[PDB]
């Protein structure tokens with residue numbers, strides 16, 4: 110009897126699809142769902158097996174309608190803090206993972222739902238996608254990184270527009286301001302997201318992971334410090350065997366085959 | 371006469387730079403009065419949004435007053451720049467949300483004033499520009515910092531190093547202007563934008579503004595910790611509970627600012 | 629042999645045009661090309677005359693393909709490390725120079741060629757312009773600051789798209805995201821880039837250089853620190869004759885005549 114929506118996980122070798130199966134509450138994130146998401150992120154980040162994950166919502170109405178407001182109604186202040194820590198840890202673990210995370214936005218992504226999308230590396234929007242950080246219309250602020258991650262993508266003026274008005278934008282508006290990387294044709298969201306995952310997986314595993322981390326770890330650094338950080342990562346990747354395979358494959362006019370070492 | 375006209379409407383006010391004969395320039399007197407206005411609205415949560423515009427249809431603000439500047443010794447220039455910095459930072463630190471309604475040319479310090487505001491609305495024939503290098507100076511009211519943070523460093527270098535004008539279509543396309551207004555409707559649009567913000571919960575709007583700005587230049591973990599500290603400002607509010615009750619009752623919330 | 633130089637240098641008073649004269653080799657950064665490039669940057673930085681430089685590649689296929697991998701395979705280990713270090717130093721010198729650098733992107737830019745474009749202050753894209761940082765296809769990451777320079781220009785979402793998927797960005801998208809400041813019509817690349825340079829050099833010489841550095845040095849600073857930096861930079865123009873001339877010209881309703889002092 111308890112309301113216990115959960116994730117479906119579809120494994121496709123180096124790529125997995127995780128679907129929020131919670132349509133009765135528009136794929137809102139409950140306490141137990143967030144615990145499960147964090148656990149799944151930890152486990153994929155301990156494999157080298159899985160190199161890309163697509164996260165999507167079941168159905169055509171909602172990617173994720175935010176935190177579950179029915180459950181939230183009577184949560185005590187410390188319980189709210191614990192939930193926000195779960196968002197923080199989980200979203201940071203997505204960023205720290207060697208795996209690349211793609212949000213396949215199939216419908217409304219509101220509040221925490223947009224925050225989940227912002228934590229991912231890449232975003233694909235279906236025609237029904239709608240994004241918004243609606244928190245101020247609920248009496249709160251974005252507490253899952255939205256006040257920070259949105260401005261990193263769109264700048265403070267557009268971030269203030271969205272966050273202070275709480276208005277919702279459609280897929281193409283999101284694309285045009287740099288919030289969605291791809292616009293999927295109607296009916297083709299998962300095919301587009303999977304193809305995006307394939308385009309990442311064909312590249313060398315450590316190079317993809319290291320480049321991802323170089324980008325995020327440069328956040329907030331002054332240029333000299335950022336360049337020194339990139340150089341440290343570049344020197345590390347020089348020692349991988351895949352780096353040598355890239356040079357050998359080029360010298361031999363053939364495709365490289367990378368092993369993730 | 372006062373440097374500004376003030377049209378107070380309770381939680382929203384409209385301030386009009388009343389300086390048409392100098393194209394609404396930032397004289398020392400204008401800057402002092404602007405600071406007094408910002409201080410007043412920042413002293414309580416009763417005024418939640420302010421629209422700033424220029425009188426007339428020629429200029430929002432033509433920048434620092436260059437006739438006054440000709441009379442100023444170097445230490446006076448430094449003092450003016452310090453007061454400009456303080457006033458623009460006071461706009462950012464204020465809980466009140468500031469909307470620049472750009473009714474005409476916004477040049478140099480005038481674009482810097484617009485950039486210090488939270489949101490910008492432009493009339494169809496309005497133009498912006500940081501023209502300082504064409505005057506032998508650089509932006510000294512934050513333009514070299516706020517513009518890049520807004521439109522990216524390449525676009526900022528274009529505008530600042532060429533000193534060119536940017537029109538309304540370009541400004542809207544790149545997000546320098548958040549809204550455009552039909553002719554004769556600039557204030558109606560800017561006031562409507564203010565009303566849209568004021569519909570939302572008072573403490574949450576102010577806290578969210580500050581979370582966005584205070585995250586500038588932070589590394590990610592520090593920025594996320596900052597946001598969680600800011601969330602504490604709304605966690606113990608009655609308005610947070612009203613949001614949840616309104617959702618439960620399938621009705622619109624009505625916030626009280628506590 | 630006559631020792632054809634790696635660059636053609638067209639001196640036009642306050643502006644120079646540098647054409648990489650390597651069309652048959654995709655305008656690659658060979659050791660010789662890098663050597664000349666670094667010395668050209670030093671020369672224009674010390675030249676009073678030269679205040680802006682347009683860099684372009686010969687032909688319509690390549691702006692600059694990056695390192696010449698055929699040459700690379702012949703280089704000893706110390707020579708490779710010296711090349712990479714010299715490349716990094718040259719990009720930093722472009723950034724620190726008072727001279728304003730405009731990349732006129734006439735074709736494909738890859739690797740170090742894209743990094744060169746990113747080190748410039750402004751970019752103009754011909755219709756054939758295409759830019760990539762596709763290193764993850766080779767088992768490596770950018771080695772000349774490309775990850776950070778790209779992310780600082782276009783943000784982390786767009787940088788992750790380009791670098792993690794190893795896809796190129798073409799002219800219209802480059803313009804939309806602020807990577808290309810101008811789109812040139814077919815056949816008019818250099819006219820557009822030269823006109824952009826002319827529009828910069830109309831302005832006061834010290835002010836232009838100081839403003840360039842104020843913009844660049846502020847990224848990564850918290851706001852109050854960034855504003856303090858701008859006021860320190862203002863000191864560089866406060867005691868100049870050109871500042872007084874701007875005020876006098878305004879008072880006298882005439883055009884200013886700047887002198888770079």
Ligand SMILES: CC(C)(COP(=O)(O)OP(=O)(O)OC[C@H]1O[C@@H](n2cnc3c(N)ncnc32)[C@H](O)[C@@H]1OP(=O)(O)O)[C@@H](O)C(=O)NCCC(=O)NCCS
Nearest residue numbers: 133134135137171174175176177178179217219220243244
């Ligand atoms: C996602 C959305 C656009 C879909 O609209 P819709 O298809 O017309 O669906 P409805 O609004 O009628 O909601 C359908 C069910 O989902 C529930 N639901 C929607 N969002 C929910 C959420 N965040 N938490 C818990 N339940 C939610 C509804 O209460 C309703 O269930 P009920 O009839 O048992 O009460 C709409 O539900 C919405 O805007 N939700 C956001 C709620 C919210 O404020 N999130 C905060 C982000 S800060």
Ligand SMILES: CC(C)(COP(=O)(O)OP(=O)(O)OC[C@H]1O[C@@H](n2cnc3c(N)ncnc32)[C@H](O)[C@@H]1OP(=O)(O)O)[C@@H](O)C(=O)NCCC(=O)NCCS
Nearest residue numbers: 391392393395428432433434435436437475477478501502
């Ligand atoms: C705003 C502008 C586009 C309007 O053009 P316009 O309607 O044709 O008005 P004018 O240029 O003829 O100027 C009208 C009056 O305003 C004054 N004025 C304009 N800008 C001024 C300024 N920043 N400071 C002091 N006075 C100014 C003019 O000196 C003139 O005064 P006068 O009537 O006593 O001779 C034009 O004034 C302009 O470009 N100003 C920019 C000045 C500047 O360089 N500001 C600093 C940017 S770094």
